[PDB]
Amino acid sequence: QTGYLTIGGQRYQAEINDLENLGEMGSGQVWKMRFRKTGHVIAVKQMRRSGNKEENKRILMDLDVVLKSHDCPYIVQCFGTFITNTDVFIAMELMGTCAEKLKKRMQGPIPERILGKMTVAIVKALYYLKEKHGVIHRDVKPSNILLDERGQIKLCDFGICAAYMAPERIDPPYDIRADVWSLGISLVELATGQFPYKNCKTDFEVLTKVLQEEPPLLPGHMGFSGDFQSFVKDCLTKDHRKRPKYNKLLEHSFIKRYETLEVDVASWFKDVMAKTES
Ligand SMILES: *CCC(=O)N1CC[C@@H](Nc2nccc(Oc3cc(C(=O)Nc4ccc(CN5CCN(CC)CC5)c(C(F)(F)F)c4)ccc3C)n2)C1
């Protein structure tokens, strides 16, 4: 724990009392706060310190990774931590909302052009986590994909019908390829406005469906581009040994196209926010 909040490339001296509470955001505990010294509005997570040694280092270990991801623009930035007797406070850049909530606000699909930018960002985030830190995510899903009013899209981990788990994770006798599967499911969900696995009696039913049924692919009658359908189908390869790794996914036409294509995510996000409530 250093003595500073690091924000937009600068290091500001800080103490817990410099933070002013503007209200809770979640429903582990999350507050919108104002840093007095600068007026920057930030997101702060409050965690109780659990007395398990190993169970309290994976707190530290995961922070370590995010703190050292300043050079990746697709990962949510951590500004710093405050540790008191009972509590760790974790200060993060505030993102407007997550993809899950945009789906709800939309009451329907998110357009492909937005999803294309989201795909490049999330794939690059994961690739970065693997190559620079040797970590895997393990919970890729729409609620862990953050957007803001500057049109940025970033990967996060909130740590707290729908199923995103790869078949080989449901029932082993997992490496990066499980996250690839979770990306694909996420995309079908966001692109259709609908959970991919349809007839959801129970949790067991759904996990059985993942194991037994064919992957739910993008439907062909919604104008989805051929390369988006292909990308999703490659992510949703059941046999994990056949499933592409990130370097192969980064070579895919869908990605290459959306890297260069100018898309105005900012204005879209602003529109959506100005036209909806929760
Ligand atoms: C659906 C949106 C929603 O409900 N919101 C409520 C709050 C709103 N905005 C917001 N803005 C920014 C941050 C935030 O929440 C936080 C996020 C994080 C965070 O993302 N933590 C984090 C931890 C760990 C990792 C690294 N990984 C290591 C490998 N594995 C472990 C096996 C997974 C974790 C990441 C990483 F993925 F790199 F991004 C991120 C922390 C604190 C807060 C407050 N809410 C939107």
Side-chain angles (χ1 to χ4, degrees), residues 1-49 51 56-159 161-200 202-278:
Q1 181 195 335
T2 71
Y4 38 86
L5 287 182
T6 303
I7 311 180
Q10 305 300 330
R11 210 148 267 182
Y12 307 103
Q13 189 226 308
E15 54 176 86
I16 321 96
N17 272 230
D18 294 318
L19 302 178
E20 166 189 0
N21 184 16
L22 313 183
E24 174 146 32
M25 290 184 290
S27 64
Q29 202 148 74
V30 184
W31 311 90
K32 191 193 281 175
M33 317 200 86
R34 183 164 172 284
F35 180 37
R36 271 190 231 301
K37 292 211 174 123
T38 68
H40 278 112
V41 175
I42 66 175
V44 184
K45 186 161 154 74
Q46 170 169 4
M47 274 171 136
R48 168 177 311 286
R49 260 159 66 191
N56 212 80
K57 281 171 209 186
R58 73 183 218 71
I59 290 164
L60 306 173
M61 187 179 64
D62 280 10
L63 293 188
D64 204 1
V65 173
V66 62
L67 283 156
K68 300 175 166 174
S69 296
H70 47 76
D71 61 333
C72 184
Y74 304 115
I75 284 162
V76 74
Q77 295 301 298
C78 181
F79 293 158
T81 64
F82 305 82
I83 314 202
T84 74
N85 289 329
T86 60
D87 289 296
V88 193
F89 296 91
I90 306 153
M92 310 287 293
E93 76 177 309
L94 179 54
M95 298 294 270
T97 192
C98 57
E100 182 198 52
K101 284 182 200 259
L102 292 166
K103 173 198 195 260
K104 285 172 180 165
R105 284 175 173 275
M106 292 287 303
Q107 303 183 283
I110 288 173
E112 179 176 335
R113 66 175 187 287
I114 305 305
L115 297 182
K117 288 296 187 180
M118 182 180 311
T119 299
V120 46
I122 300 310
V123 169
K124 283 178 174 177
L126 293 161
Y127 180 66
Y128 175 93
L129 285 175
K130 183 54 161 123
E131 298 298 299
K132 307 307 173 177
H133 298 96
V135 303
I136 196 192
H137 193 275
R138 299 185 199 161
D139 205 21
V140 176
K141 53 183 192 198
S143 64
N144 283 339
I145 296 170
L146 301 182
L147 296 87
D148 70 20
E149 60 167 30
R150 290 199 67 70
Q152 299 185 113
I153 310 169
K154 305 197 190 198
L155 184 63
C156 80
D157 188 359
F158 271 101
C161 77
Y164 305 98
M165 203 160 282
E168 82 276 356
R169 265 193 76 189
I170 293 171
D171 181 62
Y174 48 77
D175 55 29
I176 64 143
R177 276 118 62 181
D179 284 348
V180 169
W181 172 277
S182 301
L183 176 59
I185 290 302
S186 291
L187 289 167
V188 178
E189 188 184 336
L190 297 175
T192 59
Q194 196 171 13
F195 299 119
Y197 291 107
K198 304 192 136 186
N199 299 38
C200 296
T202 54
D203 307 287
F204 174 86
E205 169 66 42
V206 182
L207 300 167
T208 308
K209 291 198 207 87
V210 172
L211 288 172
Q212 296 184 353
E213 300 182 342
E214 286 302 313
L217 300 182
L218 286 180
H221 65 303
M222 299 188 53
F224 297 121
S225 72
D227 60 5
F228 185 26
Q229 291 183 58
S230 166
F231 186 85
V232 162
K233 184 183 171 158
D234 294 343
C235 294
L236 297 184
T237 311
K238 287 184 79 175
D239 187 339
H240 72 278
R241 292 181 313 288
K242 209 204 128 187
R243 200 183 300 140
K245 298 175 199 219
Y246 296 129
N247 52 10
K248 187 76 200 179
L249 290 180
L250 288 165
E251 291 161 9
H252 193 286
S253 175
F254 192 58
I255 291 281
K256 292 292 187 210
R257 197 150 73 72
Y258 274 92
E259 280 175 336
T260 59
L261 191 65
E262 80 185 323
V263 177
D264 186 7
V265 183
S267 298
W268 173 79
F269 177 99
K270 193 205 179 171
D271 288 1
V272 170
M273 292 308 166
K275 295 178 167 180
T276 64
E277 41 190 8
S278 173

PDB file of all heavy atoms in Angstrom, residues 140-170, unseen atoms left out:
ATOM      1  N   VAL A 140     -16.125 -14.352 -17.136  1.00  0.00           N
ATOM      2  CA  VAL A 140     -16.453 -13.417 -18.198  1.00  0.00           C
ATOM      3  C   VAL A 140     -17.947 -13.454 -18.404  1.00  0.00           C
ATOM      4  O   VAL A 140     -18.530 -14.526 -18.610  1.00  0.00           O
ATOM      5  CB  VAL A 140     -15.738 -13.774 -19.495  1.00  0.00           C
ATOM      6  CG1 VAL A 140     -16.165 -12.845 -20.609  1.00  0.00           C
ATOM      7  CG2 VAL A 140     -14.231 -13.680 -19.329  1.00  0.00           C
ATOM      8  N   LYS A 141     -18.585 -12.295 -18.375  1.00  0.00           N
ATOM      9  CA  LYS A 141     -20.016 -12.239 -18.600  1.00  0.00           C
ATOM     10  C   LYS A 141     -20.414 -10.805 -18.707  1.00  0.00           C
ATOM     11  O   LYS A 141     -19.598  -9.947 -18.431  1.00  0.00           O
ATOM     12  CB  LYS A 141     -20.791 -12.981 -17.484  1.00  0.00           C
ATOM     13  CG  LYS A 141     -20.439 -12.519 -16.063  1.00  0.00           C
ATOM     14  CD  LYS A 141     -21.181 -13.329 -14.992  1.00  0.00           C
ATOM     15  CE  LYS A 141     -21.003 -12.624 -13.639  1.00  0.00           C
ATOM     16  NZ  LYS A 141     -21.278 -13.444 -12.435  1.00  0.00           N
ATOM     17  N   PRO A 142     -21.636 -10.525 -19.133  1.00  0.00           N
ATOM     18  CA  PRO A 142     -21.979  -9.127 -19.397  1.00  0.00           C
ATOM     19  C   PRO A 142     -21.849  -8.171 -18.195  1.00  0.00           C
ATOM     20  O   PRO A 142     -21.518  -6.958 -18.366  1.00  0.00           O
ATOM     21  CB  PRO A 142     -23.432  -9.219 -19.854  1.00  0.00           C
ATOM     22  CG  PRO A 142     -23.508 -10.594 -20.523  1.00  0.00           C
ATOM     23  CD  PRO A 142     -22.709 -11.446 -19.588  1.00  0.00           C
ATOM     24  N   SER A 143     -22.070  -8.676 -16.995  1.00  0.00           N
ATOM     25  CA  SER A 143     -21.988  -7.797 -15.843  1.00  0.00           C
ATOM     26  C   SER A 143     -20.527  -7.401 -15.529  1.00  0.00           C
ATOM     27  O   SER A 143     -20.283  -6.439 -14.781  1.00  0.00           O
ATOM     28  CB  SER A 143     -22.740  -8.364 -14.630  1.00  0.00           C
ATOM     29  OG  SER A 143     -22.153  -9.555 -14.182  1.00  0.00           O
ATOM     30  N   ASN A 144     -19.570  -8.110 -16.132  1.00  0.00           N
ATOM     31  CA  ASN A 144     -18.167  -7.799 -15.997  1.00  0.00           C
ATOM     32  C   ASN A 144     -17.605  -7.070 -17.177  1.00  0.00           C
ATOM     33  O   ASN A 144     -16.410  -6.999 -17.355  1.00  0.00           O
ATOM     34  CB  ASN A 144     -17.393  -9.087 -15.722  1.00  0.00           C
ATOM     35  CG  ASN A 144     -17.545  -9.567 -14.286  1.00  0.00           C
ATOM     36  OD1 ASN A 144     -17.887  -8.789 -13.375  1.00  0.00           O
ATOM     37  ND2 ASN A 144     -17.293 -10.827 -14.063  1.00  0.00           N
ATOM     38  N   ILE A 145     -18.452  -6.483 -17.986  1.00  0.00           N
ATOM     39  CA  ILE A 145     -17.999  -5.700 -19.115  1.00  0.00           C
ATOM     40  C   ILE A 145     -18.547  -4.284 -18.873  1.00  0.00           C
ATOM     41  O   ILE A 145     -19.778  -4.063 -18.873  1.00  0.00           O
ATOM     42  CB  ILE A 145     -18.532  -6.274 -20.436  1.00  0.00           C
ATOM     43  CG1 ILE A 145     -17.957  -7.686 -20.681  1.00  0.00           C
ATOM     44  CG2 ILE A 145     -18.177  -5.350 -21.617  1.00  0.00           C
ATOM     45  CD1 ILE A 145     -18.643  -8.388 -21.845  1.00  0.00           C
ATOM     46  N   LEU A 146     -17.629  -3.342 -18.689  1.00  0.00           N
ATOM     47  CA  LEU A 146     -17.983  -1.969 -18.324  1.00  0.00           C
ATOM     48  C   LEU A 146     -17.878  -1.017 -19.486  1.00  0.00           C
ATOM     49  O   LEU A 146     -16.956  -1.130 -20.297  1.00  0.00           O
ATOM     50  CB  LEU A 146     -17.058  -1.476 -17.222  1.00  0.00           C
ATOM     51  CG  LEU A 146     -17.079  -2.292 -15.960  1.00  0.00           C
ATOM     52  CD1 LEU A 146     -16.164  -1.698 -14.912  1.00  0.00           C
ATOM     53  CD2 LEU A 146     -18.472  -2.396 -15.403  1.00  0.00           C
ATOM     54  N   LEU A 147     -18.847  -0.107 -19.591  1.00  0.00           N
ATOM     55  CA  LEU A 147     -18.804   0.989 -20.580  1.00  0.00           C
ATOM     56  C   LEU A 147     -18.941   2.320 -19.891  1.00  0.00           C
ATOM     57  O   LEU A 147     -19.521   2.412 -18.780  1.00  0.00           O
ATOM     58  CB  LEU A 147     -19.910   0.837 -21.600  1.00  0.00           C
ATOM     59  CG  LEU A 147     -19.777  -0.428 -22.460  1.00  0.00           C
ATOM     60  CD1 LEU A 147     -20.435  -1.651 -21.819  1.00  0.00           C
ATOM     61  CD2 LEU A 147     -20.401  -0.175 -23.817  1.00  0.00           C
ATOM     62  N   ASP A 148     -18.441   3.361 -20.548  1.00  0.00           N
ATOM     63  CA  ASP A 148     -18.576   4.759 -20.035  1.00  0.00           C
ATOM     64  C   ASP A 148     -18.884   5.715 -21.138  1.00  0.00           C
ATOM     65  O   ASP A 148     -18.901   5.337 -22.311  1.00  0.00           O
ATOM     66  CB  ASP A 148     -17.321   5.198 -19.301  1.00  0.00           C
ATOM     67  CG  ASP A 148     -16.145   5.412 -20.232  1.00  0.00           C
ATOM     68  OD1 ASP A 148     -16.356   5.594 -21.476  1.00  0.00           O
ATOM     69  OD2 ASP A 148     -15.009   5.416 -19.706  1.00  0.00           O
ATOM     70  N   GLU A 149     -19.141   6.968 -20.743  1.00  0.00           N
ATOM     71  CA  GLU A 149     -19.620   7.991 -21.678  1.00  0.00           C
ATOM     72  C   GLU A 149     -18.573   8.529 -22.646  1.00  0.00           C
ATOM     73  O   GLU A 149     -18.934   9.178 -23.622  1.00  0.00           O
ATOM     74  CB  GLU A 149     -20.328   9.140 -20.953  1.00  0.00           C
ATOM     75  CG  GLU A 149     -19.478   9.886 -19.950  1.00  0.00           C
ATOM     76  CD  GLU A 149     -20.138  11.177 -19.507  1.00  0.00           C
ATOM     77  OE1 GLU A 149     -21.405  11.225 -19.488  1.00  0.00           O
ATOM     78  OE2 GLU A 149     -19.390  12.148 -19.201  1.00  0.00           O
ATOM     79  N   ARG A 150     -17.312   8.194 -22.432  1.00  0.00           N
ATOM     80  CA  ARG A 150     -16.279   8.410 -23.435  1.00  0.00           C
ATOM     81  C   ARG A 150     -16.165   7.265 -24.466  1.00  0.00           C
ATOM     82  O   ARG A 150     -15.219   7.225 -25.248  1.00  0.00           O
ATOM     83  CB  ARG A 150     -14.949   8.637 -22.749  1.00  0.00           C
ATOM     84  CG  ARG A 150     -14.937  10.009 -22.024  1.00  0.00           C
ATOM     85  CD  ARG A 150     -13.535  10.464 -21.738  1.00  0.00           C
ATOM     86  NE  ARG A 150     -12.730  10.806 -22.959  1.00  0.00           N
ATOM     87  CZ  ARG A 150     -12.868  11.861 -23.811  1.00  0.00           C
ATOM     88  NH1 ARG A 150     -13.828  12.797 -23.702  1.00  0.00           N
ATOM     89  NH2 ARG A 150     -12.004  11.977 -24.825  1.00  0.00           N
ATOM     90  N   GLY A 151     -17.105   6.318 -24.432  1.00  0.00           N
ATOM     91  CA  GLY A 151     -17.090   5.177 -25.335  1.00  0.00           C
ATOM     92  C   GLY A 151     -16.022   4.132 -25.017  1.00  0.00           C
ATOM     93  O   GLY A 151     -15.727   3.324 -25.857  1.00  0.00           O
ATOM     94  N   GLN A 152     -15.427   4.152 -23.825  1.00  0.00           N
ATOM     95  CA  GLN A 152     -14.486   3.105 -23.449  1.00  0.00           C
ATOM     96  C   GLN A 152     -15.227   1.828 -23.056  1.00  0.00           C
ATOM     97  O   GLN A 152     -16.348   1.886 -22.584  1.00  0.00           O
ATOM     98  CB  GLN A 152     -13.621   3.547 -22.331  1.00  0.00           C
ATOM     99  CG  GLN A 152     -12.779   4.765 -22.684  1.00  0.00           C
ATOM    100  CD  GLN A 152     -11.835   5.110 -21.569  1.00  0.00           C
ATOM    101  OE1 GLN A 152     -10.623   4.985 -21.711  1.00  0.00           O
ATOM    102  NE2 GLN A 152     -12.393   5.461 -20.403  1.00  0.00           N
ATOM    103  N   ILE A 153     -14.593   0.693 -23.330  1.00  0.00           N
ATOM    104  CA  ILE A 153     -15.118  -0.629 -22.941  1.00  0.00           C
ATOM    105  C   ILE A 153     -14.012  -1.363 -22.246  1.00  0.00           C
ATOM    106  O   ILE A 153     -12.926  -1.452 -22.753  1.00  0.00           O
ATOM    107  CB  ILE A 153     -15.638  -1.446 -24.150  1.00  0.00           C
ATOM    108  CG1 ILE A 153     -16.585  -0.582 -24.969  1.00  0.00           C
ATOM    109  CG2 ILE A 153     -16.349  -2.692 -23.677  1.00  0.00           C
ATOM    110  CD1 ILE A 153     -16.960  -1.160 -26.304  1.00  0.00           C
ATOM    111  N   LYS A 154     -14.273  -1.797 -21.027  1.00  0.00           N
ATOM    112  CA  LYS A 154     -13.244  -2.431 -20.247  1.00  0.00           C
ATOM    113  C   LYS A 154     -13.747  -3.652 -19.520  1.00  0.00           C
ATOM    114  O   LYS A 154     -14.928  -3.744 -19.121  1.00  0.00           O
ATOM    115  CB  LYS A 154     -12.671  -1.451 -19.221  1.00  0.00           C
ATOM    116  CG  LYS A 154     -12.167  -0.172 -19.836  1.00  0.00           C
ATOM    117  CD  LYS A 154     -11.253   0.571 -18.862  1.00  0.00           C
ATOM    118  CE  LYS A 154     -10.912   1.972 -19.344  1.00  0.00           C
ATOM    119  NZ  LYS A 154      -9.719   2.440 -18.605  1.00  0.00           N
ATOM    120  N   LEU A 155     -12.819  -4.567 -19.323  1.00  0.00           N
ATOM    121  CA  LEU A 155     -13.045  -5.760 -18.525  1.00  0.00           C
ATOM    122  C   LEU A 155     -12.881  -5.447 -17.052  1.00  0.00           C
ATOM    123  O   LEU A 155     -11.902  -4.817 -16.637  1.00  0.00           O
ATOM    124  CB  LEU A 155     -12.026  -6.829 -18.925  1.00  0.00           C
ATOM    125  CG  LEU A 155     -12.167  -8.192 -18.273  1.00  0.00           C
ATOM    126  CD1 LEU A 155     -13.474  -8.866 -18.621  1.00  0.00           C
ATOM    127  CD2 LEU A 155     -10.986  -9.048 -18.669  1.00  0.00           C
ATOM    128  N   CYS A 156     -13.784  -5.966 -16.248  1.00  0.00           N
ATOM    129  CA  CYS A 156     -13.626  -5.876 -14.821  1.00  0.00           C
ATOM    130  C   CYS A 156     -13.961  -7.234 -14.183  1.00  0.00           C
ATOM    131  O   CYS A 156     -14.133  -8.246 -14.909  1.00  0.00           O
ATOM    132  CB  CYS A 156     -14.486  -4.746 -14.316  1.00  0.00           C
ATOM    133  SG  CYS A 156     -16.208  -5.193 -14.145  1.00  0.00           S
ATOM    134  N   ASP A 157     -13.968  -7.272 -12.852  1.00  0.00           N
ATOM    135  CA  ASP A 157     -14.419  -8.457 -12.092  1.00  0.00           C
ATOM    136  C   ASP A 157     -15.071  -8.021 -10.819  1.00  0.00           C
ATOM    137  O   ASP A 157     -14.385  -7.699  -9.863  1.00  0.00           O
ATOM    138  CB  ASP A 157     -13.268  -9.395 -11.780  1.00  0.00           C
ATOM    139  CG  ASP A 157     -13.728 -10.711 -11.168  1.00  0.00           C
ATOM    140  OD1 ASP A 157     -14.953 -10.912 -10.953  1.00  0.00           O
ATOM    141  OD2 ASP A 157     -12.867 -11.564 -10.898  1.00  0.00           O
ATOM    142  N   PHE A 158     -16.402  -7.992 -10.841  1.00  0.00           N
ATOM    143  CA  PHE A 158     -17.217  -7.635  -9.680  1.00  0.00           C
ATOM    144  C   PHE A 158     -17.271  -8.671  -8.607  1.00  0.00           C
ATOM    145  O   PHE A 158     -17.797  -8.378  -7.565  1.00  0.00           O
ATOM    146  CB  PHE A 158     -18.674  -7.347 -10.077  1.00  0.00           C
ATOM    147  CG  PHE A 158     -18.915  -5.942 -10.439  1.00  0.00           C
ATOM    148  CD1 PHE A 158     -18.987  -5.560 -11.765  1.00  0.00           C
ATOM    149  CD2 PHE A 158     -19.059  -4.981  -9.446  1.00  0.00           C
ATOM    150  CE1 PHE A 158     -19.200  -4.233 -12.103  1.00  0.00           C
ATOM    151  CE2 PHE A 158     -19.285  -3.653  -9.764  1.00  0.00           C
ATOM    152  CZ  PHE A 158     -19.361  -3.286 -11.092  1.00  0.00           C
ATOM    153  N   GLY A 159     -16.816  -9.899  -8.878  1.00  0.00           N
ATOM    154  CA  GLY A 159     -16.743 -10.957  -7.853  1.00  0.00           C
ATOM    155  C   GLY A 159     -18.041 -11.267  -7.110  1.00  0.00           C
ATOM    156  O   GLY A 159     -18.005 -11.710  -5.962  1.00  0.00           O
ATOM    157  N   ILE A 160     -19.192 -11.035  -7.736  1.00  0.00           N
ATOM    158  CA  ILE A 160     -20.483 -11.235  -7.018  1.00  0.00           C
ATOM    159  C   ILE A 160     -21.680 -10.924  -7.910  1.00  0.00           C
ATOM    160  O   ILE A 160     -21.903 -11.599  -8.912  1.00  0.00           O
ATOM    161  CB  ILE A 160     -20.599 -10.383  -5.719  1.00  0.00           C
ATOM    162  N   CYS A 161     -32.466 -17.892 -18.935  1.00  0.00           N
ATOM    163  CA  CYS A 161     -31.539 -17.918 -17.805  1.00  0.00           C
ATOM    164  C   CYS A 161     -30.065 -18.049 -18.239  1.00  0.00           C
ATOM    165  O   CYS A 161     -29.738 -18.494 -19.380  1.00  0.00           O
ATOM    166  CB  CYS A 161     -31.859 -19.076 -16.876  1.00  0.00           C
ATOM    167  SG  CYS A 161     -31.242 -20.606 -17.590  1.00  0.00           S
ATOM    168  N   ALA A 162     -29.193 -17.754 -17.272  1.00  0.00           N
ATOM    169  CA  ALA A 162     -27.812 -17.418 -17.537  1.00  0.00           C
ATOM    170  C   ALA A 162     -26.859 -18.535 -17.174  1.00  0.00           C
ATOM    171  O   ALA A 162     -26.912 -19.051 -16.070  1.00  0.00           O
ATOM    172  CB  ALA A 162     -27.449 -16.172 -16.754  1.00  0.00           C
ATOM    173  N   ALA A 163     -25.975 -18.902 -18.103  1.00  0.00           N
ATOM    174  CA  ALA A 163     -24.856 -19.781 -17.767  1.00  0.00           C
ATOM    175  C   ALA A 163     -23.739 -19.527 -18.751  1.00  0.00           C
ATOM    176  O   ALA A 163     -23.961 -19.571 -19.915  1.00  0.00           O
ATOM    177  CB  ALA A 163     -25.289 -21.243 -17.790  1.00  0.00           C
ATOM    178  N   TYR A 164     -22.549 -19.289 -18.237  1.00  0.00           N
ATOM    179  CA  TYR A 164     -21.391 -18.873 -19.002  1.00  0.00           C
ATOM    180  C   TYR A 164     -20.216 -19.823 -18.946  1.00  0.00           C
ATOM    181  O   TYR A 164     -19.225 -19.637 -19.678  1.00  0.00           O
ATOM    182  CB  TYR A 164     -20.930 -17.525 -18.497  1.00  0.00           C
ATOM    183  CG  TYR A 164     -22.042 -16.546 -18.530  1.00  0.00           C
ATOM    184  CD1 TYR A 164     -22.785 -16.260 -17.381  1.00  0.00           C
ATOM    185  CD2 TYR A 164     -22.381 -15.907 -19.714  1.00  0.00           C
ATOM    186  CE1 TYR A 164     -23.817 -15.345 -17.417  1.00  0.00           C
ATOM    187  CE2 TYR A 164     -23.424 -15.021 -19.774  1.00  0.00           C
ATOM    188  CZ  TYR A 164     -24.154 -14.760 -18.631  1.00  0.00           C
ATOM    189  OH  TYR A 164     -25.173 -13.874 -18.668  1.00  0.00           O
ATOM    190  N   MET A 165     -20.368 -20.875 -18.159  1.00  0.00           N
ATOM    191  CA  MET A 165     -19.327 -21.829 -17.883  1.00  0.00           C
ATOM    192  C   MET A 165     -19.150 -22.793 -19.041  1.00  0.00           C
ATOM    193  O   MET A 165     -20.121 -23.317 -19.584  1.00  0.00           O
ATOM    194  CB  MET A 165     -19.704 -22.583 -16.584  1.00  0.00           C
ATOM    195  CG  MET A 165     -18.548 -23.200 -15.866  1.00  0.00           C
ATOM    196  SD  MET A 165     -18.971 -23.529 -14.139  1.00  0.00           S
ATOM    197  CE  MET A 165     -18.833 -21.910 -13.388  1.00  0.00           C
ATOM    198  N   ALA A 166     -17.898 -22.964 -19.461  1.00  0.00           N
ATOM    199  CA  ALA A 166     -17.532 -23.904 -20.516  1.00  0.00           C
ATOM    200  C   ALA A 166     -17.815 -25.394 -20.141  1.00  0.00           C
ATOM    201  O   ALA A 166     -17.671 -25.765 -18.994  1.00  0.00           O
ATOM    202  CB  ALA A 166     -16.068 -23.744 -20.815  1.00  0.00           C
ATOM    203  N   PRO A 167     -18.159 -26.233 -21.103  1.00  0.00           N
ATOM    204  CA  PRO A 167     -18.517 -27.626 -20.736  1.00  0.00           C
ATOM    205  C   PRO A 167     -17.436 -28.333 -19.895  1.00  0.00           C
ATOM    206  O   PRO A 167     -17.742 -28.965 -18.882  1.00  0.00           O
ATOM    207  CB  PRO A 167     -18.692 -28.324 -22.084  1.00  0.00           C
ATOM    208  CG  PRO A 167     -18.838 -27.248 -23.067  1.00  0.00           C
ATOM    209  CD  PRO A 167     -18.151 -26.029 -22.541  1.00  0.00           C
ATOM    210  N   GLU A 168     -16.174 -28.147 -20.296  1.00  0.00           N
ATOM    211  CA  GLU A 168     -15.030 -28.710 -19.576  1.00  0.00           C
ATOM    212  C   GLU A 168     -14.815 -28.147 -18.182  1.00  0.00           C
ATOM    213  O   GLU A 168     -14.051 -28.715 -17.401  1.00  0.00           O
ATOM    214  CB  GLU A 168     -13.731 -28.592 -20.422  1.00  0.00           C
ATOM    215  CG  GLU A 168     -13.018 -27.238 -20.366  1.00  0.00           C
ATOM    216  CD  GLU A 168     -13.573 -26.201 -21.337  1.00  0.00           C
ATOM    217  OE1 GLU A 168     -14.483 -26.509 -22.135  1.00  0.00           O
ATOM    218  OE2 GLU A 168     -13.080 -25.074 -21.292  1.00  0.00           O
ATOM    219  N   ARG A 169     -15.413 -27.002 -17.877  1.00  0.00           N
ATOM    220  CA  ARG A 169     -15.412 -26.478 -16.503  1.00  0.00           C
ATOM    221  C   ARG A 169     -16.559 -27.054 -15.675  1.00  0.00           C
ATOM    222  O   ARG A 169     -16.434 -27.202 -14.470  1.00  0.00           O
ATOM    223  CB  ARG A 169     -15.502 -24.950 -16.491  1.00  0.00           C
ATOM    224  CG  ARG A 169     -14.165 -24.243 -16.403  1.00  0.00           C
ATOM    225  CD  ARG A 169     -14.352 -22.766 -16.082  1.00  0.00           C
ATOM    226  NE  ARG A 169     -14.697 -22.522 -14.672  1.00  0.00           N
ATOM    227  CZ  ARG A 169     -15.085 -21.345 -14.173  1.00  0.00           C
ATOM    228  NH1 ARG A 169     -15.190 -20.275 -14.967  1.00  0.00           N
ATOM    229  NH2 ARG A 169     -15.384 -21.228 -12.882  1.00  0.00           N
ATOM    230  N   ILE A 170     -17.688 -27.346 -16.312  1.00  0.00           N
ATOM    231  CA  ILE A 170     -18.860 -27.892 -15.601  1.00  0.00           C
ATOM    232  C   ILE A 170     -18.552 -29.275 -15.002  1.00  0.00           C
ATOM    233  O   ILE A 170     -18.932 -29.581 -13.868  1.00  0.00           O
ATOM    234  CB  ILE A 170     -20.110 -27.951 -16.517  1.00  0.00           C
ATOM    235  CG1 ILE A 170     -20.563 -26.536 -16.864  1.00  0.00           C
ATOM    236  CG2 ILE A 170     -21.271 -28.668 -15.839  1.00  0.00           C
ATOM    237  CD1 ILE A 170     -21.640 -26.449 -17.918  1.00  0.00           C
TER     238      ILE A 170
END
